[PDB]
């Protein structure tokens, strides 16, 4: 989601893409390489040195964020309810339906519903 978690191709010259960026494979043999950066990313870096992680990433494909479809979830919430991951960061919102099956952390950016029109 453009302002929070960005994706960008790597520097063809240097080979290993620019520092201050995190490399991030893409779920799908030649799994194409491209590295991510943004706000929500810069959280888990600063979060890694305080609780001592190590981490990979992978952009999910099947579904955008996650909803229920005839009794099975897709998207990011899918990748946590089915033991294929341990976290799911990015532009994800809290609500009731989600928080019944998957735990949550404390909100670090506030949001809601809003309306936008022309000037």
């Amino acid at each position: 989601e453009r302002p929070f978690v960005i994706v960008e191709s790597p520097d063809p010259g240097t080979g290993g893409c620019v520092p201050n960026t995190v490399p991030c494979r893409r779920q799908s043999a030649p799994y194409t390489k491209l590295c991510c950066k943004g706000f929500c990313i810069d959280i888990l870096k600063k979060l890694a040195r305080v609780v001592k992680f190590s981490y990979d990433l992978y952009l999910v494909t099947n579904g955008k964020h996650g909803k229920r479809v005839r009794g099975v979830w897709n998207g990011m919430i899918g990748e946590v309810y089915y033991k294929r991951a341990d976290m799911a960061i990015g532009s994800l919102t809290i609500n009731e339906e989600r928080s019944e099956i998957v735990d949550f952390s404390v909100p670090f950016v506030e949001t809601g519903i809003s309306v936008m029109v022309a000037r």
Partner: protein
Amino acid sequence: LWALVFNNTTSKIMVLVWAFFAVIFLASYTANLAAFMIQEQYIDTVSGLSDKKFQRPQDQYPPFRFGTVPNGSTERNIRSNYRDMHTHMVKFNQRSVEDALTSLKMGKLDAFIYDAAVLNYMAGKDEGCKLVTIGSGKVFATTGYGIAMQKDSHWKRAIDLALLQFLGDGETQKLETVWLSGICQNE
């Protein structure tokens, strides 16, 4: 004297004073009204979700055109309560923020509804400063982002305290002013 007075011995000296009080009044009037119209705040069409133009769209003129990128979260809040609003909302935009933004500059629709923290950003940087949010910053059904972790993990209590550390020390303020910044913000 007053007829003489409004714009064309001790008798004549008073109607003079009235003539005086004209230019002092008039100039003061045209001055005051200047400052009042030099205050730039103008009414914007709607004033909330509860409004009629949203709720019962059977008005004579065609309803406000309701765009929400579907299968998300804002949907699952609208469908849950406002049955009428949703059944009118199958005419929408489907190319997310990009579709909504072009379709709105070119009159293809008239209203948009989405997650709050990306709207008042995208409207932050935009050529000419030609978009706004009708809430004047208002937000509805306010919640916030999070980090989805497996149910009943042992990781939770740790990174739950390393977050409340960041907000509580303003280190998250350094980020917010690097990635969420607009020209149109303070204008």
